[PDB]
Write a protein that binds this ligand. Structure first.
Ligand SMILES: *[C@@H]1O[C@H](CO)[C@@H](O[C@@H]2O[C@H](CO)[C@@H](O[C@@H]3O[C@H](CO[C@H]4O[C@H](CO[C@H]5O[C@H](CO)[C@@H](O)[C@H](O)[C@@H]5O)[C@@H](O)[C@H](O[C@H]5O[C@H](CO)[C@@H](O)[C@H](O)[C@@H]5O)[C@@H]4O)[C@@H](O)[C@H](O[C@H]4O[C@H](CO)[C@@H](O)[C@H](O)[C@@H]4O)[C@@H]3O)[C@H](O)[C@H]2NC(C)=O)[C@H](O)[C@H]1NC(C)=O
Ligand SMILES: *[C@@H]1O[C@H](CO)[C@@H](O[C@@H]2O[C@H](CO)[C@@H](O[C@@H]3O[C@H](CO[C@H]4O[C@H](CO[C@H]5O[C@H](CO)[C@@H](O)[C@H](O)[C@@H]5O)[C@@H](O)[C@H](O[C@H]5O[C@H](CO)[C@@H](O)[C@H](O)[C@@H]5O)[C@@H]4O)[C@@H](O)[C@H](O[C@H]4O[C@H](CO)[C@@H](O)[C@H](O)[C@@H]4O)[C@@H]3O)[C@H](O)[C@H]2NC(C)=O)[C@H](O)[C@H]1NC(C)=O
Ligand SMILES: *[C@@H]1O[C@H](CO)[C@@H](O[C@@H]2O[C@H](CO)[C@@H](O[C@@H]3O[C@H](CO[C@H]4O[C@H](CO[C@H]5O[C@H](CO)[C@@H](O)[C@H](O)[C@@H]5O)[C@@H](O)[C@H](O[C@H]5O[C@H](CO[C@H]6O[C@H](CO)[C@@H](O)[C@H](O)[C@@H]6O)[C@@H](O)[C@H](O)[C@@H]5O)[C@@H]4O)[C@@H](O)[C@H](O)[C@@H]3O)[C@H](O)[C@H]2NC(C)=O)[C@H](O)[C@H]1NC(C)=O
Ligand SMILES: *[C@@H]1O[C@H](CO)[C@@H](O[C@@H]2O[C@H](CO)[C@@H](O[C@@H]3O[C@H](CO[C@H]4O[C@H](CO)[C@@H](O)[C@H](O)[C@@H]4O)[C@@H](O)[C@H](O[C@H]4O[C@H](CO)[C@@H](O)[C@H](O)[C@@H]4O)[C@@H]3O)[C@H](O)[C@H]2NC(C)=O)[C@H](O)[C@H]1NC(C)=O
Ligand SMILES: *[C@@H]1O[C@H](CO)[C@@H](O[C@@H]2O[C@H](CO)[C@@H](O[C@@H]3O[C@H](CO[C@H]4O[C@H](CO[C@H]5O[C@H](CO)[C@@H](O)[C@H](O)[C@@H]5O)[C@@H](O)[C@H](O)[C@@H]4O)[C@@H](O)[C@H](O)[C@@H]3O)[C@H](O)[C@H]2NC(C)=O)[C@H](O)[C@H]1NC(C)=O
Ligand SMILES: *[C@@H]1O[C@H](CO)[C@@H](O[C@@H]2O[C@H](CO)[C@@H](O[C@@H]3O[C@H](CO)[C@@H](O)[C@H](O[C@H]4O[C@H](CO)[C@@H](O)[C@H](O)[C@@H]4O)[C@@H]3O)[C@H](O)[C@H]2NC(C)=O)[C@H](O)[C@H]1NC(C)=O
Ligand SMILES: *[C@@H]1O[C@H](CO)[C@@H](O[C@@H]2O[C@H](CO)[C@@H](O[C@@H]3O[C@H](CO[C@H]4O[C@H](CO)[C@@H](O)[C@H](O)[C@@H]4O)[C@@H](O)[C@H](O)[C@@H]3O)[C@H](O)[C@H]2NC(C)=O)[C@H](O)[C@H]1NC(C)=O
Ligand SMILES: *[C@@H]1O[C@H](CO)[C@@H](O[C@@H]2O[C@H](CO)[C@@H](O[C@@H]3O[C@H](CO[C@H]4O[C@H](CO)[C@@H](O)[C@H](O)[C@@H]4O)[C@@H](O)[C@H](O)[C@@H]3O)[C@H](O)[C@H]2NC(C)=O)[C@H](O)[C@H]1NC(C)=O
Ligand SMILES: *[C@@H]1O[C@H](CO)[C@@H](O[C@@H]2O[C@H](CO)[C@@H](O[C@@H]3O[C@H](CO)[C@@H](O)[C@H](O)[C@@H]3O)[C@H](O)[C@H]2NC(C)=O)[C@H](O)[C@H]1NC(C)=O
Ligand SMILES: *[C@@H]1O[C@H](CO)[C@@H](O)[C@H](O)[C@H]1NC(C)=O
Ligand SMILES: *[C@@H]1O[C@H](CO)[C@@H](O)[C@H](O)[C@H]1NC(C)=O
Ligand SMILES: *[C@@H]1O[C@H](CO)[C@@H](O)[C@H](O)[C@H]1NC(C)=O
Ligand SMILES: *[C@@H]1O[C@H](CO)[C@@H](O)[C@H](O)[C@H]1NC(C)=O
Ligand SMILES: *[C@@H]1O[C@H](CO)[C@@H](O)[C@H](O)[C@H]1NC(C)=O
Lengths: 451, 139, 139, 139, 53
């Protein structure tokens, strides 16, 4: 029939590929307080108008565990964190023999009054000053106790910059020309599969890099009852993400009144030591509405029912094994790093079909190197004044019940073992694709004969 | 309508619009002219990801737009060719494909020999056709 | 003549030359093929400003040249369109604008609805016109 | 055939193929989409040489492709011009050059006044020819 | 005595073979851009310049 080929430029077709994305956010820190650790001094401004199209008739398949936007997220934060510590005061002189004592047992003691010998501005002379340090950040050596920083044994140390905000602000991921990000608008989205409701937004929603452990904060929640996502259910080993439908409110506060003591160690450099405490020593705490918590824990076991042995016994235990900083709900707040005992939230068990409020004990660490990074650790200077955080808790992280071969019951204890899963709680619905505008198709049409 | 608005509709509908996809292909509001405007080191991790993304932007646009120029179709968005359609590619009939397959499905149906079509495309429409002036350019 | 030599002259004169502006738009003697030719770290502040300027060079050229391709005007420097002129844009008459306003003034007279003209431009000249082959390409 | 396969053959043979050179001019298998895929600092010396080479790739392609657009030859690979050939350029005859000089030799024969030809090229084919619509576009 | 800067910020010696002599540096525009020169000899503060290049 003399069918001829004809070309079409701009054909809507795409193939799964992952390119380099970039930052987007509008007016945030600006003049009053800037120098955010994440948004740097400048990010490309987000457009006030968000573009979302409800791609019709399309049923593209998503995958949130094999998605590379979460891995791009991971290596970006690490390189972003290290870039915000590289130009600052290194605390190599802080490795000396430390002679420390308790505080007001009054013969209650979890911090120590440390005296030690340290270089001054002039290299020739030396100076002795006191400083307070939290427990575990220091360890004994061999009448008068003698201590040493826990990191001087291992890797180097560098002080966090004094005027740097560790507050997570929304960072937008958006595609490059010829690319598009596909959004899963399907409310129920068990693990990953063909999503009937797709959109091709140019820019994701407001994603906050909430550095959290075991429990997630300030995240996104779909409208249906709490969602459960696993790369593979029944592989007891793989961890479990949990999206709520309504977030719980947990407020935390450090009652300690830390004074700022700046002592120079050479020129320009100034170490910011904990001063002398004002007021009676009070342990840091977290409040959880016991009423609000009991129902959130219940809706999960209802959704987990249809995914684990139907009707049977589901228990919750305290973390289970591991290290002290990964088995507690670690996070950052105002600049000081909390580690709260989660054993008080994962102890109840329900099966077979003005107000009291739970509180959680928390300890504080000033020496940190996150993401299991053994390269270089950092000292977080004590935040002068009062501390109070008030963030929603939106996500969870669960783990194994060992290796019970079939049998009687199932238990899930928390274990935020990795940091990249935290962003997977925000990126389950997204996936980027490569537009291919070149399509060829036949039609009985040919151009002029000679030319 | 909208960007890829007809991605799921039949091929006859994508034939009808098509520009909305072609328009939003090179430049974006997302790029937004860089600079903070309104510390003095722009070597940050963000500047590296942006610039390498602005490069592949025009690198992928010009790689495809170079193909339109060697086929005599540079000036227009849809041009006809003098390459006959070979039945081994598809057995389906004229109205059977344009109303029942959608483009998304079609790209998977030709992806095997798609490069072979491109080879024959440079020949009949621009290797011979632009040469045919020899006799007709002046006698 | 010269680059922008007729920037202050009437629109009829800029219509007459025009290439001198279009020619010196993408490449420059200023770029001068980089390299010192004739310390071994080219990460200097100068190399950053140059490369980011060479990018926006072709990024701005291709952003405008992509517009000429979706209007059927890619091959030529001045092409006519099949979009009728709407009187709400300007009330002035044929010889009243080309001999009394200069382009510099004119760009300020249309900058309000200039984007709206661009929208109608893709339609009448390439959305319908390139489609009109359907009936005429072969009967 | 092959890339530059007719570089040593007569000008009549390079006239016959020509695309193989034009095709492999912008994109390469060598670029291979960067990234390791399959330490976390891509500031290495290799990334600097690659990106500065990808830039001059399209910078040299667009510098030459901009010349084809201002001559009315953008859509095609070989276009005829309305500039008469001036005898001071070469004294040789029609079949004397196309069968005895090869292109490699020819580029050295015109390199003296090659830029002067380019100047006259913008004029007769696009400065006047695109202007000639004035009388013929509508009467 | 003590150096006046050891009190404040750090210190770094200037390189031994480095010329601090000001030499002419030219600023020039990127493609699609142009620099406009005020060729008006009298140019009180700033205003409309009749002689532009
Ligand atoms: C999950 O999300 C939640 C919610 O976002 C998040 O919790 C927030 O955490 C951030 C830090 O990470 C908190 O922000 C800090 O707030 C510090 C305390 O001050 C706060 O409250 C002030 C109250 O002001 C009212 O009342 C006063 C009188 O009491 C009155 O004058 C005011 O007009 C007003 O009525 C508030 O003002 C203040 O911030 C604004 O205004 C002050 C001036 O009024 C200005 O100075 C601030 O810059 C700002 O414009 C603030 O909200 C604050 O100290 C801290 O740092 C700033 O101050 C220190 C003090 O020295 C400076 O050194 C530094 O340079 C900064 O300027 C910072 O602003 C925020 O409050 C939390 N929640 C709220 C309520 O939004 C969780 O962290 C997230 N999850 C995670 C992962 O943690
Ligand atoms: C505003 O503008 C003014 C004007 O430009 C500017 O003033 C200039 O400042 C610069 C420095 O900033 C001066 O340059 C320095 O000159 C140093 C001294 O030598 C000078 O004079 C030499 C005279 O040579 C004549 O006589 C001798 C015998 O006496 C004879 O052999 C010669 O042939 C000649 O007849 C002159 O030669 C010399 O520079 C040139 O020639 C010598 C060799 O002859 C060569 O070695 C030089 O490299 C050069 O080619 C120079 O002009 C000079 O020491 C200094 O640094 C050089 O020498 C040191 C010495 O060890 C080396 O260590 C170093 O590596 C360098 O090679 C530098 O050249 C300049 O002279 C001022 N003005 C003039 C006259 O131009 C102001 O600074 C500006 N405003 C501000 C903001 O300051
Ligand atoms: C973390 O650790 C750091 C470690 O540094 C803590 O910081 C330290 O905190 C302690 C708190 O006790 C400070 O000690 C203070 O020292 C000042 C200055 O010293 C003057 O007074 C001394 C008085 O003797 C002390 O001890 C006797 C014992 O009974 C008490 O009765 C008395 O009240 C005092 O506490 C003098 O010895 C010293 O000598 C010279 O002046 C004397 C002046 O007259 C004093 O002594 C006479 C008897 O001689 C008394 O009658 C008279 O009332 C007066 O007390 C003179 O007689 C003598 O001959 C000398 O000339 C100084 O004058 C005291 O004023 C405070 O009372 C207290 O003892 C440390 O100074 C401080 N560290 C530093 C940096 O110095 C830090 O607190 C901790 N963390 C916390 C929780 O903050
Ligand atoms: C824990 O969770 C509680 C309950 O959600 C939070 O309390 C809510 O906090 C949110 C945000 O912090 C508030 O949410 C939104 O406020 C909007 C403000 O109005 C307009 O202007 C702003 C600024 O320009 C725009 O960003 C915004 O889009 C609006 O144009 C409301 O308008 C929003 O309501 C409706 O429209 C938006 C538009 O897309 C939708 O996205 C919303 O779903 C909604 O349909 C929205 O309300 C909110 O007001 C607070 N209350 C409630 C009950 O939600 C805590 O802040 C939160 N804590 C943290 C830190 O997680
Ligand atoms: C900080 O850096 C210092 C120096 O490098 C480290 O060394 C210790 O510093 C402390 C001071 O903070 C020393 O203790 C002091 O010693 C004084 C005199 O020492 C001399 O005599 C001692 C015995 O005392 C007799 O004589 C004194 C003379 O004043 C009389 O007052 C006494 O009554 C006795 O008769 C000898 O042991 C010593 O070797 C000297 O010969 C003394 O007057 C003070 O009261 C105080 O005791 C200490 O000796 C230094 N060395 C040691 C062994 O630690 C220091 O460790 C660094 N940081 C720390 C951890 O503090
Ligand atoms: C998991 O949760 C269960 C409850 O659902 C919990 O069992 C309860 O533990 C608490 C605390 O250990 C018990 O309360 C104690 O009861 C004894 C008498 O049996 C009292 O003597 C205790 O009083 C002292 O301590 C109090 C603070 O703990 C002080 O306030 C008080 O003044 C006294 O000094 C205290 O009231 C409680 O009896 C049990 N049982 C029940 C049914 O409540 C279990 O421990 C949790 N497990 C974990 C590891 O989380
Ligand atoms: C989310 O929902 C998705 C849609 O249902 C789930 O995808 C399904 O996953 C299962 C398991 O991976 C796929 O295959 C199943 O295979 C079992 C095993 O069949 C064999 O053994 C049984 C007896 O045990 C025997 O009767 C059979 O003959 C076989 O010998 C079958 O029993 C199931 O019927 C089913 O075929 C499904 O094909 C797959 N559905 C699809 C196509 O989407 C997904 O697992 C859910 N979870 C997550 C995290 O995504
Ligand atoms: C360089 O030369 C420029 C050209 O002359 C100067 O620009 C002129 O600047 C002035 C002041 O900014 C502008 O306006 C003036 O306003 C005063 C005030 O008028 C009011 O008060 C007076 C009495 O004091 C009263 O009589 C009036 O009715 C008002 O109530 C007027 O007195 C002046 O006449 C004048 O209007 C000029 O408009 C402006 N000229 C222009 C348009 O260029 C410039 O200031 C000089 N300096 C610099 C550094 O550039
Ligand atoms: C977090 O700390 C905050 C205080 O900083 C506690 O917030 C307060 O919670 C009480 C709960 O009864 C609220 O009381 C009632 O609030 C309603 C509105 O929701 C109001 O209509 C009533 O009159 C009464 O005030 C109180 O408003 C609320 N304060 C604010 C402004 O949030 C919070 O309870 C702590 N989290 C936990 C674990 O409870
Ligand atoms: C958690 O449970 C284990 C037993 O599995 C117990 O030994 C331990 O004391 C409990 N507490 C924590 C928080 O480790
Ligand atoms: C206690 O919590 C319940 C449920 O959130 C609420 O209705 C009640 O008002 C709270 N306390 C009282 C007695 O006001
Ligand atoms: C199509 O081309 C292939 C490869 O040359 C050939 O095998 C086949 O017979 C052709 N079919 C026709 C007749 O178009
Ligand atoms: C021009 O277009 C505008 C917007 O559609 C319309 O309001 C106006 O009447 C038009 N004028 C004419 C008649 O061209
Ligand atoms: C060719 O052009 C040159 C320069 O204008 C002129 O000198 C020469 O006479 C011309 N030859 C002819 C007649 O084409």
């Amino acid at each position: 029939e003399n069918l001829w080929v004809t070309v079409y430029y701009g054909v809507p077709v795409w193939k799964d590929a992952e390119t380099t994305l970039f930052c987007a956010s509008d007016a945030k820190a600006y003049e009053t307080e800037k120098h955010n650790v994440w948004a740097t001094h400048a990010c490309v401004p987000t457009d006030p108008n968000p573009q979302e199209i409800h791609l019709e008739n399309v049923t593209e398949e998503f995958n949130m565990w094999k998605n590379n936007m979460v891995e791009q997220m991971h290596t970006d934060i690490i390189s972003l964190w290290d870039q915000s510590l590289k130009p600052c005061v290194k605390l190599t002189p802080l490795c000396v023999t430390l002679q420390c004592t308790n505080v007001t047992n009054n013969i209650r003691g979890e911090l120590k009054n440390c005296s030690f010998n340290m270089t001054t501005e002039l290299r020739d002379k030396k100076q002795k000053v006191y400083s307070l340090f939290y427990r575990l950040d220091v360890v004994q050596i061999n009448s008068n106790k003698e201590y040493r920083l826990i990191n001087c044994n291992t890797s180097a140390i560098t002080q966090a910059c004094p005027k740097v905000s560790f507050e997570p602000i929304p960072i937008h991921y958006c595609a490059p020309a010829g690319f598009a990000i596909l959004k899963c608008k399907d409310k129920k989205f068990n693990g990953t599969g063909p999503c009937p409701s797709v959109s091709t937004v140019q820019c994701t929603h407001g994603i906050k890099p909430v550095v959290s452990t075991q429990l997630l904060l300030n995240g996104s929640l779909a409208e249906e009852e709490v969602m459960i996502r696993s790369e593979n259910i029944t592989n007891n080993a793989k961890n479990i993400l949990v999206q709520f439908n309504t977030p719980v409110q947990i407020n935390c506060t450090r009652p300690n009144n830390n004074t700022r003591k700046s002592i120079r160690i050479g020129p320009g450099q100034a170490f910011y030591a904990t001063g002398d405490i004002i007021g009676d020593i009070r342990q840091a705490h977290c409040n959880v509405s016991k009423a609000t918590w009991n129902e959130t824990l219940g809706k999960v076991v209802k959704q987990l029912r249809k995914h684990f042995g139907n009707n049977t016994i589901i228990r919750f235990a305290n973390s289970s094994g591991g290290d002290l900083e990964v088995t507690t709900h670690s996070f950052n707040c105002g600049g000081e790093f909390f580690y709260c005992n989660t054993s008080g939230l994962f102890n109840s068990t329900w099966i077979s079909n003005s107000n009291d409020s739970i509180t959680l004990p928390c300890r504080i660490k000033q020496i940190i190197n996150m993401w299991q990074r053994i390269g270089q650790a950092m000292y977080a200077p004590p935040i002068q004044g009062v501390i109070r955080c008030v963030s929603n808790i939106t996500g969870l992280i669960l783990t194994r019940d060992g290796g019970s071969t079939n049998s009687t019951t199932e238990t899930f204890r928390p274990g935020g073992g990795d940091m990249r899963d935290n962003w997977r709680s925000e990126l389950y619905k997204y996936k980027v694709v490569k537009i291919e505008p070149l399509g060829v198709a036949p039609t009985r049409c040919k151009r002029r004969v000679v030319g | 309508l909208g960007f890829l608005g007809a991605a799921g509709s039949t091929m006859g509908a994508a034939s009808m619009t098509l520009t909305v996809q072609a328009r939003n292909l090179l430049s974006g509001i997302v790029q937004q002219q860089s600079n903070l405007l309104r510390h003095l080191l722009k070597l940050t991790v963000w500047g590296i990801k942006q610039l390498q993304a602005r490069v592949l932007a025009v690198e992928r646009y010009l790689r495809d737009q170079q193909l339109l120029g060697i086929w005599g179709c540079s000036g227009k968005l849809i041009c006809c060719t003098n390459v006959p359609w070979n039945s081994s590619w598809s057995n389906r009939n004229l109205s059977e494909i344009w109303d029942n397959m959608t483009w998304l499905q079609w790209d998977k149906e030709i992806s095997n020999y798609t490069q072979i079509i491109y080879g024959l495309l440079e020949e009949s429409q621009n290797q011979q056709e632009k040469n045919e002036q020899d006799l007709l350019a002046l006698d």
